[PDB]
Amino acid sequence: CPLEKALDVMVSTFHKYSGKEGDKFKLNKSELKELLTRELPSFLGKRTDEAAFQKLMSNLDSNRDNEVDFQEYCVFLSCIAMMCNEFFEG
């Protein structure tokens, strides 16, 4: 069923990228950018530079540790899901 497939992909996608550099269960700035470019390309705006990307990183990383953990990653995904829920995305 797509929903369990969907939940599984959501979890899977986190590790596919988190365990490449450093802490294997957190996404560093480099790991987060590849995940967004490769997996959520439909959502990217027109600014692809590191400065623009850094602003976003700062938004997700609640506990301020220059990394995005799984908890933080789900929050982000839910925020995306809710945004897509409105009449007009944004």
Binding residues for Ca(2+): 26, 31, 61, 63, 65, 67, 72
Residue 74 near its own copies by CB under 8 A: yes
Instruction: Report the nearest approach of its own copies to the CB of residue 40 (Å).
Output: 6
Alpha helices in 1-90 (DSSP H): 2-18, 29-39, 50-60, 70-83
Place of tokens 């009449």: 87
Stretch touching its own copies by CB under 8 A, among 26-34, 45-53, 60-68, 69-77: 69-77
Nearest to residue 73, comparing CAs of 30, 35, 46, 41?
Answer: 35
Instruction: Report the nearest approach of Ca ion to the CB of residue 37 (Å).
Output: 16
